[PDB]
Design an enzyme around this catalytic site. Structure first.
Site, PDB file in Angstrom:
ATOM      1  N   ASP A 131       0.807  -1.234   0.000  1.00  0.00           N
ATOM      2  CA  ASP A 131       0.000   0.000   0.000  1.00  0.00           C
ATOM      3  C   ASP A 131       0.824   1.259   0.000  1.00  0.00           C
ATOM      4  O   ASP A 131       0.492   2.248   0.680  1.00  0.00           O
ATOM      5  CB  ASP A 131      -0.940   0.004   1.209  1.00  0.00           C
ATOM      6  CG  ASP A 131      -2.110   0.976   1.038  1.00  0.00           C
ATOM      7  OD1 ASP A 131      -2.570   1.210  -0.108  1.00  0.00           O
ATOM      8  OD2 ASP A 131      -2.575   1.488   2.068  1.00  0.00           O
ATOM      9  N   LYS A 133       1.978   4.648  -0.747  1.00  0.00           N
ATOM     10  CA  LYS A 133       1.337   5.840  -1.299  1.00  0.00           C
ATOM     11  C   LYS A 133       1.777   7.037  -0.503  1.00  0.00           C
ATOM     12  O   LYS A 133       2.327   6.880   0.583  1.00  0.00           O
ATOM     13  CB  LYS A 133      -0.174   5.729  -1.273  1.00  0.00           C
ATOM     14  CG  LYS A 133      -0.742   5.436   0.094  1.00  0.00           C
ATOM     15  CD  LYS A 133      -2.261   5.400   0.023  1.00  0.00           C
ATOM     16  CE  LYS A 133      -2.879   4.759   1.230  1.00  0.00           C
ATOM     17  NZ  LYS A 133      -4.352   4.711   1.024  1.00  0.00           N
ATOM     18  N   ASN A 136       0.868   7.694   3.174  1.00  0.00           N
ATOM     19  CA  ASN A 136       1.438   6.810   4.199  1.00  0.00           C
ATOM     20  C   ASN A 136       2.893   7.143   4.576  1.00  0.00           C
ATOM     21  O   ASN A 136       3.540   6.386   5.314  1.00  0.00           O
ATOM     22  CB  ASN A 136       1.338   5.369   3.727  1.00  0.00           C
ATOM     23  CG  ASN A 136      -0.060   4.810   3.825  1.00  0.00           C
ATOM     24  OD1 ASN A 136      -1.012   5.503   4.169  1.00  0.00           O
ATOM     25  ND2 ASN A 136      -0.195   3.539   3.478  1.00  0.00           N
TER      26      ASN A 136
HETATM   27  C1  LIG Z   1      -0.958   6.163   7.052  1.00  0.00           C
HETATM   28  C2  LIG Z   1      -2.033   6.700   7.956  1.00  0.00           C
HETATM   29  C3  LIG Z   1      -3.071   7.481   7.094  1.00  0.00           C
HETATM   30  N1  LIG Z   1      -2.630   5.489   8.483  1.00  0.00           N
HETATM   31  C4  LIG Z   1      -2.313   4.997   9.679  1.00  0.00           C
HETATM   32  O1  LIG Z   1      -2.877   3.976   9.992  1.00  0.00           O
HETATM   33  C5  LIG Z   1      -1.363   5.727  10.569  1.00  0.00           C
HETATM   34  C6  LIG Z   1      -0.881   5.154  11.760  1.00  0.00           C
HETATM   35  C7  LIG Z   1      -0.037   5.869  12.576  1.00  0.00           C
HETATM   36  C8  LIG Z   1       0.361   7.160  12.224  1.00  0.00           C
HETATM   37  N2  LIG Z   1       1.255   7.895  13.017  1.00  0.00           N
HETATM   38  C9  LIG Z   1       2.320   7.401  13.715  1.00  0.00           C
HETATM   39  O2  LIG Z   1       2.644   6.227  13.776  1.00  0.00           O
HETATM   40  N3  LIG Z   1       2.973   8.404  14.346  1.00  0.00           N
HETATM   41  C10 LIG Z   1       2.324   9.611  14.049  1.00  0.00           C
HETATM   42  N4  LIG Z   1       2.558  10.879  14.410  1.00  0.00           N
HETATM   43  C11 LIG Z   1       1.767  11.880  14.000  1.00  0.00           C
HETATM   44  C12 LIG Z   1       0.670  11.619  13.175  1.00  0.00           C
HETATM   45  C13 LIG Z   1       0.403  10.300  12.776  1.00  0.00           C
HETATM   46  C14 LIG Z   1       1.231   9.291  13.214  1.00  0.00           C
HETATM   47  C15 LIG Z   1      -0.094   7.724  11.024  1.00  0.00           C
HETATM   48  C16 LIG Z   1      -0.961   7.034  10.195  1.00  0.00           C
HETATM   49  N5  LIG Z   1      -1.471   7.584   9.004  1.00  0.00           N
HETATM   50  C17 LIG Z   1      -1.303   8.988   8.607  1.00  0.00           C
HETATM   51  C18 LIG Z   1      -1.804  10.070   9.528  1.00  0.00           C
HETATM   52  C19 LIG Z   1      -2.788   9.839  10.455  1.00  0.00           C
HETATM   53  C20 LIG Z   1      -3.219  10.872  11.282  1.00  0.00           C
HETATM   54  C21 LIG Z   1      -2.649  12.131  11.155  1.00  0.00           C
HETATM   55  C22 LIG Z   1      -1.649  12.366  10.228  1.00  0.00           C
HETATM   56  C23 LIG Z   1      -1.222  11.331   9.405  1.00  0.00           C
END
Ligand SMILES: CC1(C)NC(=O)c2ccc(-n3c(=O)[nH]c4ncccc43)cc2N1Cc1ccccc1
Length: 336
Positions: A131, A133, A136
């Protein structure tokens, strides 16, 4: 021991098909994390139970690499699943590319190289990511990349192994998947191509007004390379967009030796000794200004679950979900 009430959810950083991700502070301490929260009833009806377990397992492997999101711990309740992640406040690449439309050559080259290292690490462990993209890819406080969301991964892909599930995000899906062929890590190198093309050019290489037309484009058309595009960048893209998977760079040859990357010392890169060309603007460890304001404005809340479904499902479905790393365990037991 550990409960969601032990944290203060200061903000919702994002929501969507992945659930909700909160900026969370553990109790008193000045220690912040990103908590991804899922409702078990939603996971169940979305048929995402196994993806959730894959994600947990792959994340246990991920603390060993600098360019993947690190998980401190994972716990469940009767209604909820929680991943307690590293808080990364540099912002995601989709968010950053929105204002500038496309990344300059050196910035894109840098992101591509770090993504190569993360992907090659996953492949060497028998993991196909499936996945890849822009959505991510997160940035840390210094501008280094972090690959997130391991729910789509296929495990045990070492050796003479292939799998056959139709999955991905439509713009990035490899033609061998579209043609229903059994596949391996080749699919990640096509997606990588799509991602790089988007970084350099500011739009996707394949197009359609519906999925049928888009999938036709992916199967049949030659990507557009504008005349201004650096020749080594074009050349790399040409070698990634080879439809025969066994002839695709990343599957064949040595992608690290491509001339686009000739200035990269890969060992230095992996130790984070090369400065990112883009430095996120961050004022503190809790600063959340590099995220979409659409989400930040929402009061953090976990929603109710459908009791009938919760009470009727086999809870053993999420057996062995829970996991805690030693550093996290120390922090908890210190404030016990
Ligand atoms: C890839 C996606 C969409 N899917 C996920 O399951 C995901 C899991 C964990 C984190 N994630 C993480 O692991 N550390 C993070 N720190 C800040 C923010 C997000 C953090 C981010 C994730 N995202 C993107 C995202 C989510 C919410 C807000 C900003 C971006």
């Amino acid at each position: 021991k550990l409960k969601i009430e032990d944290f203060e959810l200061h903000k919702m950083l994002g929501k969507g098909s992945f659930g909700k991700v909160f900026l969370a502070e553990f109790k008193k301490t000045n220690q912040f994390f990103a908590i991804k929260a899922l409702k078990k009833d939603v996971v169940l009806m979305d048929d995402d139970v196994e993806c959730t377990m894959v994600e947990k397992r792959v994340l246990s492997l991920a603390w060993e690499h600098p360019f993947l999101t690190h998980m401190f711990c994972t716990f469940q309740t009767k209604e909820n699943l929680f991943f307690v992640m590293e808080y990364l406040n540099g912002g995601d690449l989709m968010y950053h590319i929105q204002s500038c439309h496309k990344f300059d050559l050196s910035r894109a080259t840098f992101y591509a190289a770090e993504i190569i290292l993360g992907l090659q690490f996953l492949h060497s462990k028998g993991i196909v990511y499936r996945d890849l993209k822009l959505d991510n890819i997160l940035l840390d406080k210094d501008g280094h990349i972090k690959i997130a969301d391991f729910g789509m991964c296929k495990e045990n892909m070492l050796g003479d192994a292939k799998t056959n599930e139709f999955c991905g995000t439509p713009d990035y899906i490899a033609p061998e998947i579209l043609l229903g062929q059994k596949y391996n890590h080749s699919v990640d190198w096509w997606s990588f191509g799509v991602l790089l093309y988007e970084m350099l050019i500011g739009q996707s290489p394949f197009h359609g007004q519906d999925e049928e037309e888009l999938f036709h484009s992916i199967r049949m058309d030659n990507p557009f390379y504008p005349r201004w595009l650096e020749k080594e960048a074009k050349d790399l893209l040409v070698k990634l967009f080879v439809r025969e998977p066994e002839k695709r760079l990343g599957v064949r040859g040595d992608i690290r030796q491509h001339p686009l990357f000739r200035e990269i010392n890969w060992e230095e890169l992996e130790r984070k000794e090369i400065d990112p060309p883009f430095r996120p603007k961050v004022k503190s460890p809790f600063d959340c200004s590099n995220f979409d304001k659409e989400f930040l404005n929402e009061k953090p809340r976990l929603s109710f679950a459908d009791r009938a479904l919760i009470n009727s499902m086999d809870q053993n479905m999420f057996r062995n979900f829970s996991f805690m790393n030693p550093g996290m365990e120390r922090l908890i037991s210190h404030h016990h």
